[PDB]
Amino acid sequence: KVEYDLKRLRNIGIAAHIDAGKTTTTERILYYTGRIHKIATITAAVTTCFWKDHRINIIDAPGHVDFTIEVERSMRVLDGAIVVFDSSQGVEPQSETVWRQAEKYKVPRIAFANKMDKTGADLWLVIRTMQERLGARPVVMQLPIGREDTFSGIIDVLRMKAYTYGNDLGTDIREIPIPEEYLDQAREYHEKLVEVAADFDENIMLKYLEGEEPTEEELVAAIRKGTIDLKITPVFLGSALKNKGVQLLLDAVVDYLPSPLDIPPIKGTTPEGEVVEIHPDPNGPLAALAFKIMADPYVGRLTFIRVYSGTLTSGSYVYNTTKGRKERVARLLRMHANHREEVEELKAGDLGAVVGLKETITGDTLVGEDAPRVILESIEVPEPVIDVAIEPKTKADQEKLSQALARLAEEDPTFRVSTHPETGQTIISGMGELHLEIIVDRLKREFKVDANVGKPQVAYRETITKPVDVEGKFIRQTGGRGQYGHVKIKVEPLPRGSGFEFVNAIVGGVIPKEYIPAVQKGIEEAMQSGPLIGFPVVDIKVTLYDGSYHEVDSSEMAFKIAGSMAIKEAVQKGDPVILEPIMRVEVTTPEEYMGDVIGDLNARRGQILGMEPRGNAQVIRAFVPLAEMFGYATDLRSKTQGRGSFVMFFDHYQEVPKQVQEKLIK
Numbered sequence: 001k002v003e004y005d006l007k008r009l010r011n012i013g014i015a016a017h018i019d020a021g022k023t024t025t026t027e028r029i030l031y032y033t034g035r036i037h038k039i040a041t042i043t044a045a046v047t048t049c050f051w052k053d054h055r056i057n058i059i060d061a062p063g064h065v066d067f068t069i070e071v072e073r074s075m076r077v078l079d080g081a082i083v084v085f086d087s088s089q090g091v092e093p094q095s096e097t098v099w100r101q102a103e104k105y106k107v108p109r110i111a112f113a114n115k116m117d118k119t120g121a122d123l124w125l126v127i128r129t130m131q132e133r134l135g136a137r138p139v140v141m142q143l144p145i146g147r148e149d150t151f152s153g154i155i156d157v158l159r160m161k162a163y164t165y166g167n168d169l170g171t172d173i174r175e176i177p178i179p180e181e182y183l184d185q186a187r188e189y190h191e192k193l194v195e196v197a198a199d200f201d202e203n204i205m206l207k208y209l210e211g212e213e214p215t216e217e218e219l220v221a222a223i224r225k226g227t228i229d230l231k232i233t234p235v236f237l238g239s240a241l242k243n244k245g246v247q248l249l250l251d252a253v254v255d256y257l258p259s260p261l262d263i264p265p266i267k268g269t270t271p272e273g274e275v276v277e278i279h280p281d282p283n284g285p286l287a288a289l290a291f292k293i294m295a296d297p298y299v300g301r302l303t304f305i306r307v308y309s310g311t312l313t314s315g316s317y318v319y320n321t322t323k324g325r326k327e328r329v330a331r332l333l334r335m336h337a338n339h340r341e342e343v344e345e346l347k348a349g350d351l352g353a354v355v356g357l358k359e360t361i362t363g364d365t366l367v368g369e370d371a372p373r374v375i376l377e378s379i380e381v382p383e384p385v386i387d388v389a390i391e392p393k394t395k396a397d398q399e400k401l402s403q404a405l406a407r408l409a410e411e412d413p414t415f416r417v418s419t420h421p422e423t424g425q426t427i428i429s430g431m432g433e434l435h436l437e438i439i440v441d442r443l444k445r446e447f448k449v450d451a452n453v454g455k456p457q458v459a460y461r462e463t464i465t466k467p468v469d470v471e472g473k474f475i476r477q478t479g480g481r482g483q484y485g486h487v488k489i490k491v492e493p494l495p496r497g498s499g500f501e502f503v504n505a506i507v508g509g510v511i512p513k514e515y516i517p518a519v520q521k522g523i524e525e526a527m528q529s530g531p532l533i534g535f536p537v538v539d540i541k542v543t544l545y546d547g548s549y550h551e552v553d554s555s556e557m558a559f560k561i562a563g564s565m566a567i568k569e570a571v572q573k574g575d576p577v578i579l580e581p582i583m584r585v586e587v588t589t590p591e592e593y594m595g596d597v598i599g600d601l602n603a604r605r606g607q608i609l610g611m612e613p614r615g616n617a618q619v620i621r622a623f624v625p626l627a628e629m630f631g632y633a634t635d636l637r638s639k640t641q642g643r644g645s646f647v648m649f650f651d652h653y654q655e656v657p658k659q660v661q662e663k664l665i666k
């Protein structure tokens with residue numbers, strides 16, 4: 001027997017500018033691969049299929065489309081990529097953005113000039129622009145027969161044969177000889193191809209010299225080596241829509257894209273912090289990454305995983321190293337184009353879905369019960385730095401918004417719901433504009449919740465900068481009785497990020513013990529709104545140390561208020577100050593636009609940390625206030641002729657300069 005072979009795995013992702021043909025190309029890969037296995041929602045995060053004895057796991061799901069969380073993780077999870085270019089989109093400036101991503105995560109790729117049928121279809125413009133702008137070193141693997149409407153065929157220039165397509169349905173294909181008017185062009189590019197292969201094979205170099213045509217297999221193997229070691233980009237061509245070229249692209253996935261053997265081992269960290277390489281050994285200890293959780297309308301919660309080492313067995317227990325608990329793997333599944341398949345196991349190099357696993361979230365590492373504890377993804381609590389207010393038009397929209405968030409907080413445990421202290425509205429808080437922007441689209445559409453949605457707003461905080469010693473006195477005859485509460489507190493600043501710290505130095509019934517929770521609750525509520533701009537108070541330690549009470553007039557109501565009053569007083573007395581989030585920012589740019597990107601970041605109150613090169617591009621690292629980063633994606637495209645791209649992570653909170661302090665009151 002046999003079925004699992006590591007050499008025959010081909011984990012891929014299709015990377016394309018929006019509208020280039022990612023989806024159509026994927027659908028067509030799924031149609032052609034599913035033909036043999038028929039006479040003996042979609043899409044899923046990973047969809048398996050078969051071609052010429054090889055298993056191709058097609059990694060997607062994102063959604064989005066700027067969402068760096070989903071993109072990073074999905075790149076570690078695939079081994080190789082097909083970058084689809086639109087042949088008819090002339091400049092295609094943001095098609096560069098997705099190339100930079102593949103370069104960033106060191107993923108071997110082939111290219112597919114995908115709309116040859118269309119008006120404007122220009123293979124050569126794709127090759128030249130790949131050369132000049134991306135520094136990709138493309139190698140022409142195919143030549144088109146016909147142009148635009150009359151696009152009828154494709155020449156494979158490696159093997160010196162061609163194919164004609166008798167229809168647009170993908171149901172008539174015939175190995176033809178290279179026709180007359182194309183044959184000279186094929187000889188030129190075939191020996192250009194042989195020339196490129198000679199750089200990664202000394203045997204082929206010696207053959208090229210003599211004019212001896214090398215063996216097809218030696219040629220495939222040399223282009224493959226150069227592809228996998230990131231020195232060339234084989235280019236193929238077609239119309240996905242008109243079912244021309246998609247079977248040859250599938251051949252290229254097997255010929256040139258990597259198995260999980262061919263790429264460097266994934267890097268992981270022990271709990272000790274020692275970095276280690278994780279080899280794809282199916283009989284080794286299990287190590288696996290959850291990279292997408294998925295609600296399902298049949299089997300329920302599905303966590304999609306990539307096994308890097310060992311074997312994951314259905315009916316086993318695995319250890320979630322990020323959290324600290326055993327979980328039960330109930331079942332394993334592969335998602336095919338039309339159907340599900342139950343499987344007994346997923347070995348190293350492979351991907352699928354596990355039912356079970358209730359407490360595992362995206363990015364979590366799963367290892368064997370008695371296996372080395374490794375953490376693949378670096379741990380980080382991502383800060384809710386952006387809030388959006390949201391008001392349902394009726395009471396009927398209130399309860400189905402409450403369901404929209406409690407049900408969407410389980411798939412995505414990374415946002416934070418609350419209620420504005422001085423208004424009373426629902427406030428979703430998250431890692432960015434676009435995290436909240438698509439939560440809002442899932443709310444109004446998928447959960448049918450129409451609501452008055454407010455401007456995105458940065459999550460400012462407030463704190464004090466010197467120690468203070470203050471009172472709160474609530475003493476009133478209100479609502480038919482006397483009320484009395486009296487607190488004294490020392491408040492002092494805590495180290496940035498340390499949070500909140502309450503200390504009871506009440507020494508002798510000076511405030512009766514029964515009212516001590518009341519004063520804490522008062523302190524708590526009053527910290528929700530600071531004196532400067534009404535935003536939460538953080539990073540302080542409060543110490544209750546004196547007070548008084550009245551024999552009959554004191555109450556929890558009175559001491560709570562006395563607590564609020566004391567906190568209000570202290571924050572205003574304590575040289576208060578606004579804290580804003582500061583983001584880590586990596587901008588990728590062409591070098592001619594590079595001085596202009598630095599200057600613009602400095603005008604945004606940025607500090608430049610340092611730039612290193614990435615391909616023919618340049619990666620600038622910097623700190624900038626998130627408050628200064630609004631509308632940045634458009635402003636960056638303006639100063640890079642659309643070729644730039646960035647990613648943005650929370651780093652720390654810092655004290656705003658007093659010039660900004662004044663601007664924020666209104």
Ligand SMILES: Nc1nc2c(ncn2[C@@H]2O[C@H](COP(=O)(O)OP(=O)(O)O)[C@@H](O)[C@H]2O)c(=O)[nH]1
Binds near residue numbers: 114240
């Ligand atoms: N004319 C032409 N259109 C295509 C081709 N491939 C895809 N499209 C169309 O381009 C549009 C966007 O396609 P899609 O695959 O969804 O792009 P995506 O956003 O990158 O997933 C769709 O309406 C497709 O039908 C092609 O080969 N030729």
Ligand SMILES: [Mg+2]
Binds near residue numbers: 022023
């Ligand atoms: Mg799509």
